[PDB]
Amino acid sequence: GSHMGLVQRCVIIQKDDNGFGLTVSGDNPVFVQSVKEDGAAMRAGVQTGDRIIKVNGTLVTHSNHLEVVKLIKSGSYVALTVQGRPPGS
């Protein structure tokens, strides 16, 4: 098939008075570069440099960070299906 681990973990992010702390960057694809340490991101179970599969059951196409940001900000609570395999000792 595709990918190696092929493992995905569901992590719903909750918007606060300040907003989503974690930040993502990627033209075509979508991966989280920074995460809110000890914040909404840390509580949601987000990892730095994680791959984004879909947002709220909606695939992300086209190259436009604004669209992703708008899509994520579209609502306070938005699901973010990411992909990543923890260390291996």
Side-chain angles (χ1 to χ4, degrees):
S2 195
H3 299 69
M4 286 230 56
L6 197 64
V7 188
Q8 316 125 270
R9 63 203 281 167
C10 60
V11 285
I12 309 141
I13 312 297
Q14 316 107 288
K15 182 145 110 297
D16 309 338
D17 250 330
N18 268 290
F20 295 132
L22 54 85
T23 333
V24 295
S25 268
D27 266 29
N28 263 15
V30 186
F31 63 86
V32 187
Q33 63 186 351
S34 50
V35 295
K36 199 67 139 211
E37 57 219 30
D38 216 308
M42 205 248 210
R43 218 126 156 162
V46 191
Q47 302 77 235
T48 337
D50 230 30
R51 308 151 156 78
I52 313 294
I53 310 136
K54 45 192 239 266
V55 285
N56 224 62
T58 312
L59 263 79
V60 186
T61 42
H62 312 317
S63 338
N64 220 116
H65 196 345
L66 219 144
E67 285 207 331
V68 187
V69 186
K70 283 195 298 98
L71 261 147
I72 304 151
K73 263 202 207 146
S74 81
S76 309
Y77 304 74
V78 187
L80 179 94
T81 329
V82 297
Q83 211 183 71
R85 262 214 144 173
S89 268

Coordinates of all heavy atoms in Angstrom, one line a residue:
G1 N 0.8 -1.2 0.0 CA 0.0 0.0 0.0 C 0.8 1.3 0.0 O 1.9 1.3 -0.6
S2 N 0.4 2.3 0.7 CA 1.1 3.6 0.8 C 1.6 3.8 2.2 O 1.1 3.2 3.2 CB 0.2 4.7 0.3 OG 0.9 5.9 0.1
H3 N 2.6 4.7 2.3 CA 3.1 5.0 3.6 C 3.7 3.8 4.3 O 3.5 2.7 3.9 CB 2.0 5.7 4.5 CG 1.5 6.9 4.0 ND1 0.7 7.0 2.8 CD2 1.6 8.2 4.4 CE1 0.3 8.2 2.6 NE2 0.9 9.0 3.5
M4 N 4.4 4.0 5.4 CA 5.1 2.9 6.1 C 4.2 2.5 7.3 O 3.5 1.5 7.3 CB 6.4 3.3 6.6 CG 7.5 3.4 5.6 SD 9.0 2.5 6.0 CE 8.3 0.9 6.3
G5 N 4.2 3.3 8.4 CA 3.4 3.0 9.5 C 1.9 3.0 9.2 O 1.2 2.1 9.7
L6 N 1.4 4.0 8.5 CA 0.0 4.1 8.1 C -0.9 4.2 9.3 O -2.0 3.8 9.4 CB -0.4 2.9 7.3 CG -1.7 3.0 6.5 CD1 -1.6 4.1 5.5 CD2 -2.1 1.7 5.9
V7 N -0.3 4.8 10.4 CA -1.1 5.0 11.6 C -1.5 6.5 11.8 O -0.8 7.4 11.6 CB -0.2 4.6 12.9 CG1 -1.0 4.6 14.1 CG2 0.5 3.3 12.7
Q8 N -2.8 6.6 12.1 CA -3.4 7.9 12.3 C -4.1 8.1 13.6 O -4.6 7.1 14.1 CB -4.4 8.2 11.2 CG -3.9 7.8 9.8 CD -4.9 6.9 9.1 OE1 -4.7 5.7 9.2 NE2 -5.8 7.4 8.3
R9 N -4.0 9.3 14.2 CA -4.6 9.5 15.5 C -5.5 10.8 15.4 O -5.1 11.8 15.0 CB -3.5 9.7 16.6 CG -2.7 10.9 16.3 CD -1.3 10.8 17.0 NE -1.4 11.1 18.4 CZ -0.4 10.8 19.3 NH1 0.7 10.2 18.9 NH2 -0.6 11.1 20.6
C10 N -6.8 10.6 15.9 CA -7.7 11.7 15.9 C -7.4 12.7 17.1 O -7.3 12.2 18.2 CB -9.1 11.2 16.0 SG -9.5 10.2 17.5
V11 N -7.4 14.0 16.8 CA -7.1 15.0 17.8 C -7.9 16.2 17.6 O -7.6 17.0 16.7 CB -5.6 15.3 17.9 CG1 -4.8 14.2 18.6 CG2 -5.1 15.6 16.5
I12 N -9.0 16.4 18.3 CA -9.9 17.6 18.2 C -9.3 18.8 18.9 O -9.0 18.7 20.1 CB -11.3 17.3 18.7 CG1 -11.8 16.0 18.1 CG2 -12.2 18.5 18.4 CD1 -12.6 15.2 19.0
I13 N -9.2 19.9 18.2 CA -8.6 21.1 18.8 C -9.8 22.1 19.2 O -10.7 22.2 18.5 CB -7.7 21.8 17.9 CG1 -6.7 20.9 17.3 CG2 -7.0 23.0 18.6 CD1 -5.8 20.2 18.3
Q14 N -9.6 22.7 20.4 CA -10.6 23.6 20.9 C -10.1 25.1 20.9 O -9.0 25.3 21.4 CB -11.0 23.2 22.3 CG -11.3 21.8 22.5 CD -10.2 21.1 23.3 OE1 -9.1 20.9 22.8 NE2 -10.5 20.7 24.5
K15 N -10.8 26.0 20.3 CA -10.4 27.4 20.2 C -10.6 28.1 21.5 O -11.6 27.8 22.2 CB -11.2 28.1 19.1 CG -10.8 29.5 18.9 CD -10.9 30.0 17.4 CE -12.0 30.9 17.2 NZ -13.4 30.3 17.5
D16 N -9.7 28.9 21.9 CA -9.8 29.7 23.1 C -9.9 31.2 22.9 O -10.1 31.6 21.7 CB -8.5 29.4 24.0 CG -8.2 27.9 24.1 OD1 -9.1 27.1 24.0 OD2 -7.1 27.6 24.4
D17 N -9.8 32.0 23.9 CA -10.0 33.4 23.8 C -8.9 34.0 22.9 O -9.1 35.0 22.2 CB -9.9 34.1 25.2 CG -11.2 34.6 25.7 OD1 -12.0 35.1 24.8 OD2 -11.4 34.7 26.9
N18 N -7.7 33.3 22.9 CA -6.6 33.8 22.1 C -6.6 33.1 20.7 O -6.3 33.7 19.7 CB -5.3 33.5 22.8 CG -4.8 34.6 23.6 OD1 -4.4 35.7 23.1 ND2 -4.8 34.5 24.9
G19 N -7.0 31.9 20.7 CA -7.1 31.1 19.4 C -6.2 29.9 19.4 O -5.5 29.7 20.4
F20 N -6.2 29.2 18.3 CA -5.4 28.0 18.2 C -3.9 28.3 18.2 O -3.4 29.2 17.5 CB -5.7 27.3 16.8 CG -7.1 26.7 16.7 CD1 -7.9 27.0 15.6 CD2 -7.6 26.0 17.8 CE1 -9.2 26.5 15.5 CE2 -8.9 25.4 17.7 CZ -9.7 25.7 16.6
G21 N -3.2 27.7 19.2 CA -1.8 28.0 19.3 C -1.0 27.3 18.3 O -0.1 27.9 17.7
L22 N -1.2 26.0 18.0 CA -0.5 25.2 17.1 C -0.6 25.9 15.7 O -1.6 26.4 15.3 CB -1.0 23.8 17.0 CG -2.5 23.7 16.8 CD1 -2.8 23.7 15.3 CD2 -3.1 22.4 17.4
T23 N 0.5 25.8 15.0 CA 0.6 26.4 13.6 C 1.0 25.3 12.6 O 1.9 24.5 12.9 CB 1.5 27.6 13.6 OG1 1.6 28.2 14.9 CG2 1.1 28.6 12.6
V24 N 0.5 25.4 11.4 CA 0.8 24.5 10.3 C 1.4 25.2 9.1 O 1.1 26.4 8.9 CB -0.4 23.7 9.9 CG1 -0.8 22.7 11.0 CG2 -1.5 24.5 9.4
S25 N 2.2 24.5 8.3 CA 2.7 25.1 7.1 C 2.9 24.1 6.0 O 3.4 23.0 6.2 CB 4.1 25.8 7.4 OG 3.9 27.2 7.7
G26 N 2.5 24.4 4.8 CA 2.6 23.5 3.7 C 1.8 23.9 2.5 O 0.6 24.1 2.5
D27 N 2.5 24.1 1.3 CA 1.8 24.5 0.1 C 0.7 23.5 -0.3 O -0.5 23.7 -0.1 CB 2.8 24.6 -1.1 CG 3.3 26.0 -1.2 OD1 3.4 26.8 -0.2 OD2 3.7 26.4 -2.3
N28 N 1.1 22.4 -0.9 CA 0.2 21.3 -1.3 C -0.3 20.5 -0.1 O -1.5 20.5 0.2 CB 0.9 20.4 -2.3 CG 0.6 20.7 -3.8 OD1 0.1 21.8 -4.0 ND2 0.8 19.8 -4.7
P29 N 0.6 19.9 0.6 CA 0.2 19.1 1.8 C -0.1 20.0 3.0 O -0.3 21.2 2.9 CB 1.5 18.3 2.1 CG 2.6 19.1 1.6 CD 2.0 19.9 0.4
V30 N -0.2 19.4 4.2 CA -0.5 20.1 5.4 C 0.1 19.4 6.6 O -0.4 18.3 7.0 CB -2.0 20.3 5.6 CG1 -2.3 21.2 6.8 CG2 -2.6 20.9 4.3
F31 N 1.1 20.0 7.2 CA 1.7 19.4 8.4 C 1.9 20.5 9.5 O 2.3 21.6 9.2 CB 3.0 18.8 8.1 CG 4.0 19.7 7.5 CD1 4.9 20.4 8.4 CD2 4.2 19.9 6.2 CE1 5.8 21.3 7.9 CE2 5.1 20.8 5.7 CZ 5.9 21.5 6.5
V32 N 1.7 20.1 10.8 CA 1.9 21.0 11.9 C 3.4 21.2 12.2 O 4.1 20.2 12.4 CB 1.2 20.5 13.1 CG1 1.2 21.6 14.2 CG2 -0.3 20.1 12.8
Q33 N 3.8 22.5 12.2 CA 5.2 22.8 12.5 C 5.4 23.1 14.0 O 6.4 22.7 14.6 CB 5.7 23.9 11.6 CG 4.9 25.2 11.9 CD 5.3 26.4 10.9 OE1 6.3 26.2 10.2 NE2 4.6 27.5 11.0
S34 N 4.5 23.9 14.5 CA 4.6 24.3 15.9 C 3.3 23.8 16.7 O 2.2 23.7 16.1 CB 4.8 25.8 16.0 OG 3.8 26.5 15.2
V35 N 3.4 23.6 18.0 CA 2.3 23.2 18.8 C 2.3 24.0 20.1 O 3.3 24.3 20.7 CB 2.3 21.7 19.1 CG1 2.2 20.9 17.8 CG2 3.6 21.3 19.8
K36 N 1.1 24.3 20.6 CA 0.9 25.1 21.8 C 1.3 24.2 23.0 O 0.5 23.4 23.5 CB -0.5 25.5 22.0 CG -0.7 26.7 23.0 CD 0.0 27.9 22.5 CE -0.9 29.2 22.8 NZ -0.6 30.2 21.7
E37 N 2.5 24.4 23.5 CA 3.0 23.6 24.7 C 2.3 24.0 25.9 O 2.1 25.2 26.2 CB 4.5 23.9 24.8 CG 4.9 25.3 25.0 CD 6.2 25.7 24.3 OE1 6.5 25.0 23.3 OE2 6.9 26.6 24.8
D38 N 1.8 23.0 26.6 CA 1.0 23.3 27.9 C -0.2 24.1 27.6 O -0.6 24.9 28.5 CB 1.9 23.9 28.9 CG 1.6 23.5 30.3 OD1 0.5 23.5 30.7 OD2 2.6 23.1 31.0
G39 N -0.8 23.9 26.4 CA -2.0 24.7 26.1 C -3.1 23.8 25.5 O -3.1 22.6 25.7
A40 N -3.9 24.4 24.6 CA -5.0 23.7 23.9 C -4.4 22.6 23.1 O -5.0 21.5 23.0 CB -5.8 24.7 23.1
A41 N -3.3 22.9 22.4 CA -2.7 21.9 21.5 C -2.1 20.7 22.4 O -2.4 19.5 22.0 CB -1.5 22.5 20.7
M42 N -1.4 21.0 23.4 CA -0.9 20.0 24.3 C -2.0 19.1 24.9 O -1.8 17.9 25.1 CB 0.0 20.6 25.4 CG 1.1 19.6 26.0 SD 0.7 19.2 27.7 CE 2.4 18.9 28.3
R43 N -3.1 19.7 25.2 CA -4.2 19.0 25.8 C -4.9 18.2 24.8 O -5.5 17.1 25.1 CB -5.2 20.0 26.5 CG -5.8 19.5 27.8 CD -5.6 20.5 28.9 NE -6.6 20.4 29.9 CZ -6.5 20.9 31.2 NH1 -5.4 21.5 31.5 NH2 -7.4 20.7 32.1
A44 N -4.9 18.7 23.5 CA -5.6 18.0 22.5 C -4.8 16.8 22.0 O -5.3 15.9 21.3 CB -5.9 18.9 21.3
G45 N -3.5 16.7 22.3 CA -2.6 15.7 21.9 C -2.0 15.9 20.6 O -2.1 15.0 19.7
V46 N -1.4 17.1 20.4 CA -0.7 17.4 19.1 C 0.8 17.3 19.2 O 1.4 17.5 20.3 CB -1.1 18.8 18.7 CG1 -0.7 19.1 17.3 CG2 -2.6 19.1 18.9
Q47 N 1.4 16.9 18.1 CA 2.9 16.7 18.1 C 3.5 17.7 17.1 O 2.9 18.0 16.1 CB 3.2 15.3 17.8 CG 2.7 14.3 18.7 CD 1.2 14.0 18.5 OE1 0.4 14.1 19.4 NE2 0.8 13.6 17.3
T48 N 4.7 18.1 17.3 CA 5.4 19.0 16.4 C 5.9 18.3 15.2 O 6.5 17.2 15.3 CB 6.6 19.6 17.2 OG1 6.4 19.6 18.6 CG2 6.9 21.1 16.8
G49 N 5.6 18.8 14.0 CA 6.0 18.2 12.8 C 5.1 17.0 12.4 O 5.6 16.1 11.8
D50 N 3.8 17.1 12.7 CA 2.9 16.1 12.4 C 2.2 16.3 11.1 O 2.0 17.4 10.6 CB 1.8 16.0 13.5 CG 1.6 14.6 14.1 OD1 2.6 13.8 14.1 OD2 0.5 14.2 14.5
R51 N 1.8 15.2 10.4 CA 1.2 15.3 9.1 C -0.3 15.3 9.3 O -0.9 14.6 10.1 CB 1.6 14.0 8.3 CG 3.1 13.8 8.2 CD 3.4 12.3 8.0 NE 4.7 12.2 7.4 CZ 5.9 12.3 8.0 NH1 5.9 12.6 9.3 NH2 7.0 12.1 7.4
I52 N -0.9 16.2 8.5 CA -2.4 16.4 8.5 C -3.1 15.6 7.4 O -2.8 15.8 6.2 CB -2.8 17.9 8.4 CG1 -2.0 18.7 9.4 CG2 -4.3 18.0 8.7 CD1 -2.2 18.4 10.8
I53 N -4.0 14.7 7.8 CA -4.7 13.9 6.8 C -5.9 14.6 6.3 O -6.2 14.7 5.1 CB -5.0 12.5 7.4 CG1 -3.8 11.8 8.0 CG2 -5.6 11.6 6.3 CD1 -4.1 11.2 9.3
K54 N -6.7 15.0 7.3 CA -8.0 15.7 7.0 C -8.4 16.6 8.1 O -8.0 16.4 9.3 CB -9.1 14.7 6.6 CG -9.1 13.5 7.5 CD -10.0 12.4 7.0 CE -11.2 12.1 7.9 NZ -10.8 11.0 8.8
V55 N -9.3 17.5 7.9 CA -9.8 18.4 8.9 C -11.4 18.3 9.0 O -12.1 18.7 8.1 CB -9.5 19.9 8.6 CG1 -8.0 20.1 8.9 CG2 -9.8 20.3 7.2
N56 N -11.8 17.7 10.1 CA -13.2 17.6 10.4 C -13.9 16.7 9.3 O -15.0 17.0 8.8 CB -13.9 18.9 10.4 CG -14.9 19.0 11.6 OD1 -14.6 18.9 12.7 ND2 -16.2 19.2 11.2
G57 N -13.2 15.6 8.9 CA -13.7 14.7 7.9 C -13.7 15.4 6.5 O -14.5 15.0 5.7
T58 N -12.8 16.3 6.3 CA -12.8 17.0 5.0 C -11.3 17.2 4.5 O -10.5 17.8 5.2 CB -13.4 18.4 5.1 OG1 -14.7 18.3 5.8 CG2 -13.6 19.1 3.8
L59 N -11.0 16.5 3.4 CA -9.7 16.6 2.9 C -9.3 18.0 2.5 O -10.1 18.8 2.1 CB -9.6 15.7 1.6 CG -9.0 14.3 1.9 CD1 -10.1 13.4 2.5 CD2 -8.5 13.7 0.6
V60 N -8.0 18.3 2.6 CA -7.5 19.6 2.3 C -6.7 19.6 1.0 O -5.6 19.0 0.8 CB -6.6 20.1 3.4 CG1 -6.2 21.6 3.1 CG2 -7.2 20.0 4.7
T61 N -7.3 20.3 -0.1 CA -6.7 20.3 -1.4 C -6.3 21.8 -1.7 O -6.5 22.7 -0.9 CB -7.6 19.8 -2.4 OG1 -8.9 20.3 -2.2 CG2 -7.7 18.3 -2.5
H62 N -5.7 22.0 -2.9 CA -5.2 23.3 -3.3 C -4.2 23.9 -2.4 O -4.2 23.5 -1.2 CB -6.4 24.2 -3.4 CG -7.6 23.7 -4.1 ND1 -7.5 22.9 -5.3 CD2 -8.9 23.7 -3.9 CE1 -8.7 22.6 -5.7 NE2 -9.6 23.0 -4.9
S63 N -3.3 24.7 -2.9 CA -2.3 25.3 -2.1 C -2.7 26.7 -1.6 O -2.8 27.7 -2.4 CB -1.0 25.5 -2.9 OG -1.0 24.5 -4.0
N64 N -3.0 26.8 -0.3 CA -3.4 28.1 0.3 C -3.5 28.0 1.8 O -4.5 27.4 2.3 CB -4.7 28.5 -0.3 CG -4.8 30.0 -0.6 OD1 -4.9 30.5 -1.7 ND2 -4.7 30.8 0.5
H65 N -2.6 28.5 2.5 CA -2.6 28.4 4.0 C -3.8 29.1 4.5 O -4.4 28.7 5.5 CB -1.3 29.1 4.5 CG -1.0 28.8 6.0 ND1 -2.0 28.2 6.8 CD2 0.1 28.9 6.7 CE1 -1.5 28.0 8.0 NE2 -0.2 28.5 8.0
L66 N -4.2 30.2 3.9 CA -5.3 31.0 4.3 C -6.6 30.1 4.4 O -7.4 30.2 5.3 CB -5.6 32.2 3.4 CG -6.0 33.5 4.1 CD1 -5.4 34.7 3.4 CD2 -7.6 33.6 4.1
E67 N -6.7 29.3 3.4 CA -7.9 28.4 3.3 C -7.8 27.4 4.5 O -8.9 27.1 5.1 CB -7.9 27.6 2.0 CG -8.3 28.4 0.8 CD -8.9 27.6 -0.3 OE1 -8.5 26.4 -0.4 OE2 -9.8 28.1 -1.1
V68 N -6.7 26.9 4.8 CA -6.5 25.9 5.9 C -6.8 26.6 7.2 O -7.5 26.1 8.0 CB -5.1 25.4 5.9 CG1 -5.0 24.3 7.0 CG2 -4.6 24.8 4.5
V69 N -6.2 27.8 7.3 CA -6.5 28.6 8.6 C -7.9 28.9 8.7 O -8.5 28.8 9.8 CB -5.6 29.9 8.5 CG1 -5.8 30.6 9.9 CG2 -4.2 29.6 8.2
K70 N -8.6 29.3 7.6 CA -10.0 29.7 7.6 C -10.8 28.4 7.9 O -11.8 28.5 8.6 CB -10.4 30.3 6.3 CG -10.0 31.7 6.1 CD -10.7 32.4 5.0 CE -10.4 31.7 3.6 NZ -11.5 30.7 3.3
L71 N -10.4 27.3 7.3 CA -11.0 26.0 7.5 C -10.9 25.6 9.0 O -11.9 25.2 9.6 CB -10.4 25.0 6.6 CG -11.2 24.7 5.3 CD1 -10.2 24.3 4.2 CD2 -12.2 23.6 5.6
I72 N -9.8 25.7 9.6 CA -9.5 25.4 11.0 C -10.3 26.3 11.9 O -10.9 25.9 12.9 CB -8.0 25.3 11.3 CG1 -7.3 24.4 10.4 CG2 -7.8 24.9 12.8 CD1 -5.8 24.8 10.2
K73 N -10.2 27.6 11.6 CA -10.8 28.6 12.4 C -12.4 28.7 12.2 O -13.1 29.3 12.9 CB -10.3 30.0 12.1 CG -9.2 30.5 13.1 CD -9.0 32.0 13.1 CE -7.6 32.4 13.5 NZ -7.1 33.6 12.8
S74 N -12.8 28.0 11.1 CA -14.2 27.9 10.8 C -15.1 27.7 12.0 O -16.2 28.1 12.1 CB -14.5 26.8 9.7 OG -14.5 25.5 10.4
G75 N -14.5 27.0 13.0 CA -15.3 26.7 14.2 C -14.4 26.5 15.4 O -13.2 26.2 15.3
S76 N -14.9 26.7 16.6 CA -14.1 26.6 17.8 C -13.6 25.2 17.9 O -12.4 25.0 18.0 CB -15.0 26.9 19.0 OG -15.7 28.1 18.9
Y77 N -14.5 24.2 17.9 CA -14.0 22.8 18.0 C -14.0 22.1 16.6 O -15.0 22.0 15.9 CB -15.0 22.0 18.9 CG -15.1 22.6 20.3 CD1 -15.8 23.7 20.5 CD2 -14.5 21.9 21.3 CE1 -15.9 24.3 21.8 CE2 -14.6 22.5 22.6 CZ -15.3 23.6 22.8 OH -15.4 24.2 24.1
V78 N -12.8 21.8 16.1 CA -12.6 21.2 14.8 C -11.7 20.0 14.8 O -10.6 20.1 15.3 CB -12.1 22.2 13.8 CG1 -12.1 21.6 12.4 CG2 -12.9 23.5 13.8
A79 N -12.2 18.9 14.3 CA -11.3 17.7 14.3 C -10.2 17.8 13.3 O -10.3 18.4 12.3 CB -12.2 16.5 14.0
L80 N -9.0 17.2 13.7 CA -7.8 17.3 12.9 C -7.2 15.9 12.8 O -6.3 15.6 13.7 CB -6.9 18.3 13.4 CG -5.6 18.5 12.6 CD1 -5.7 19.6 11.6 CD2 -4.4 18.7 13.5
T81 N -7.5 15.1 11.8 CA -6.9 13.8 11.6 C -5.5 13.9 11.1 O -5.2 14.3 10.0 CB -7.7 13.0 10.6 OG1 -9.1 13.3 10.7 CG2 -7.6 11.5 10.8
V82 N -4.5 13.6 12.0 CA -3.1 13.7 11.7 C -2.5 12.3 11.6 O -3.1 11.3 11.9 CB -2.3 14.5 12.7 CG1 -2.8 16.0 12.7 CG2 -2.5 13.9 14.1
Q83 N -1.2 12.2 11.2 CA -0.5 11.0 11.0 C 0.9 11.1 11.6 O 1.6 12.1 11.3 CB -0.5 10.5 9.6 CG -0.4 9.0 9.4 CD -0.3 8.6 7.9 OE1 0.7 8.8 7.3 NE2 -1.4 8.1 7.4
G84 N 1.4 10.1 12.3 CA 2.7 10.1 12.8 C 3.0 8.9 13.7 O 2.2 8.5 14.5
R85 N 4.2 8.3 13.5 CA 4.6 7.2 14.3 C 5.6 7.5 15.4 O 6.7 7.9 15.0 CB 5.1 6.1 13.4 CG 4.1 5.0 13.0 CD 4.8 3.6 12.9 NE 3.9 2.6 13.4 CZ 4.2 1.3 13.2 NH1 5.3 0.9 12.6 NH2 3.4 0.3 13.7
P86 N 5.3 7.4 16.7 CA 6.2 7.7 17.8 C 7.5 7.0 17.6 O 7.7 6.2 16.8 CB 5.5 7.2 19.0 CG 4.0 7.2 18.6 CD 4.0 6.9 17.2
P87 N 8.5 7.4 18.5 CA 9.9 6.8 18.4 C 9.8 5.3 18.5 O 8.8 4.7 18.6 CB 10.5 7.4 19.7 CG 9.8 8.6 20.0 CD 8.4 8.4 19.5
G88 N 11.0 4.7 18.3 CA 11.1 3.2 18.3 C 12.2 2.7 19.3 O 12.7 1.6 19.0
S89 N 12.5 3.5 20.3 CA 13.5 3.1 21.3 C 14.9 2.9 20.6 O 15.8 2.3 21.2 CB 13.1 1.8 22.0 OG 12.4 2.1 23.2

